[PDB]
Subunit: 202 residues, 4 copies
């Protein structure tokens, strides 16, 4: 009941802050809808709880919680069980509401995303659209190239994503260099299909 | 009512600290006057509240709260809506009392400022004074040049400013290089009018 | 009684988190067994308590708490009392349950370990096993070489270890360069006995 | 009364921690004697309180609290009022008990000290002793040279010092390069009187 009580306290604090800034009741509604989807009436201090454990127990728990997600991801079917673990322990859960732009083309990228549930549209400057759904990943090209985002990515439904920051990305890939080659190969093919080629991926 | 209660608790804690250090009742008055203007009886944990949201919702809220400020700023009238967003999310509100020196000439600079409400005087070593008011910015030349502050800046009224740190400055400007050129052009003209030229701005 | 009360509060919070994630009662049992061995019904905020002290008092306390551990370690019998102090203040206590792999061969290493109580097995890719017990250390070769772990290390009993991170390691060894030579000599001999030679240790 | 209550709570927490580690009643006495001299029955959260203020108010308060200390220090009599301010805002108060070694010869140095109240002995390897008292500073040579401590420094009475870390030191001295020359000159003379010369001070 501490987890529920903490949800209630933090939400009330948001309500107060929204009241103070005189936000539209319709936008407050949007915030509430976000809290409901993202937290579902509960807040745990995950990092604090896992911080009390040792390494193996931390990795056991996360592997356990992320079983359905891992089953769904081609990246991981075939991959080393320990690469899968090194990624999982670095993931941040995030939720987006339909219509929200997750990534805008042309900006500097600082994270990658894995789709657990939802549909996203990858939109090029030139108006071509490709859909990505459960088990796919996007946002990695910028991280490989140290360049800019090559396309926009817009939630077409509620999306439940896990993000991975550029430092955690580069770290896991120092440890698993074969997996860098796997990401670059897909990146090259994805770029080709949108009229692009970057030779730093070769 | 948590926001008010937190103001009261933190103020009382300051009172205690001032009592302990036996500060003059007139200087305590000055502190109280500062708390009143800066907080207006409320303390929110903004960073904690916004930390619970996703990116788009964070940016929506800030864009919303900063509408009057943005309207007032020539820097932003004409500028990309997304450059404006990248700056806004990095701003720290600060208040100064009349007579306070915000910037002293000759020192190393670590932040820039945007005026929301108030009058400042830009004072040269040679005694020339230029006034800056709502919608203007100062403190940027040092950040561009990696040199020292080229003039002093003194609050002539209560000022309500937003500051931007040198790291956030350089970060936004990596992402929007055209805006670096816009800052340098104004910087060159401002320097010329005070007898200065620095070739690292060309 | 604050220390006990804090154990109870934090454990209850873990229970809640495990209930939420619907973890097997047998794995929850494993977690509880871990809490019991690691904390023994108490949680102190060590870093906060020691943070209030000065340097000498901090070092006195730690030297005192770690007397049995220091007696048991050949590394330290003969070593400078001040090298021993510089290491001790940087140690993190950790507990492992029988069967847990502390180190997997082939991965990047970020810490070293000192055994206070327990038996570990050092396992090579080629299936050779060497046991290490109270007073020994493992996990240092990777830190010296900036390479990868040269063997796996598996707890064969409950182990009570103290870890030392790669930054604290390199820091103490900048201050005591003779002790780097002592670690490298043992490292060279340990590698030789497992079919390995790395010339960056010479 | 929050400040007193916080002293009581934190002390009780130390008592508990000492009871747990079965520390000698005589060493517990030493800890209590330290708390009494260092805190005098009160704990303020200084950094949190000053964090709520603007720059000028922060600097006013510290200048005010440190008036007796500043009067006593030759380094500062004559120095720019703004160099004095830049140092003061970076100082950490610390207390040492008679007999404690503040600095051991031969180690890497990470801070400097200013004496507010007390007597210290500067002891060379060769057994020569020089006393330093209110208004003096020690611990700076290592910071200038990036070398090792050139002498030991032992509290001969209770000492009330303010420390300045190597980063804050180098930072203030980037901003006031004339003051680096002032420190180096005294450093050269101090070294000469103990049989030493380091050419990186020229
Ligand atoms: N042809 C494609 N098919 C699917 N996804 C793509 C394609 N091209 C780009 N993307 C994604 O759009 C993302 C936009 O950000 P990034 O460039 O970092 O990474 C990009 C890809 O992950
Ligand atoms: N001619 C000018 N007109 C208006 N403002 C100025 C002028 N010259 C300098 N300033 C401001 O004074 C500031 C002092 O700090 P900075 O050099 O960092 O940046 C400087 C400018 O932003
Ligand atoms: N021959 C050996 N005898 C005992 N321990 C060893 C031997 N070889 C390797 N180890 C330990 O196994 C550890 C695995 O990680 P590291 O390479 O970092 O350091 C290694 C050693 O500390
Ligand atoms: N001749 C001297 N007189 C007074 N103090 C000294 C003398 N020589 C060294 N010290 C102090 O002893 C300190 C030991 O640490 P540091 O070398 O960092 O700096 C040294 C000086 O500040």
């Amino acid at each position: 009941d501490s987890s529920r009580r903490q949800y209630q306290e933090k939400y009330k604090q948001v309500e107060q802050y929204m009241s103070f800034h005189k936000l539209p009741a319709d936008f407050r509604q949007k915030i509430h809808d976000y809290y409901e989807h993202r937290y579902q009436g509960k807040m745990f201090d995950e990092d604090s709880i896992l911080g009390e454990l040792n390494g193996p127990l931390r990795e056991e728990i996360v592997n356990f919680n992320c079983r359905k997600l891992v089953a769904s991801m081609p990246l991981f079917a075939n991959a080393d069980p320990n690469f899968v673990t090194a990624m999982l322990t670095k993931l941040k859960f995030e939720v987006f509401q339909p219509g929200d732009y997750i990534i805008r083309e042309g900006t500097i990228g600082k994270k990658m995303y894995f789709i657990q549930h939802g549909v996203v549209s990858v939109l090029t400057k030139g108006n071509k659209e490709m859909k990505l759904s459960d088990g796919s990943y996007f946002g990695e090209i910028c991280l490989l190239t140290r360049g800019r985002r090559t396309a926009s990515v817009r939630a077409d439904t509620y999306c439940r994503l896990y993000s991975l920051s550029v430092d955690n990305f580069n770290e896991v890939l120092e440890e698993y260099p074969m997996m860098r080659r796997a990401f670059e190969t897909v990146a090259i093919d994805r770029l080709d299909r949108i009229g692009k080629k970057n030779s730093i991926l070769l």
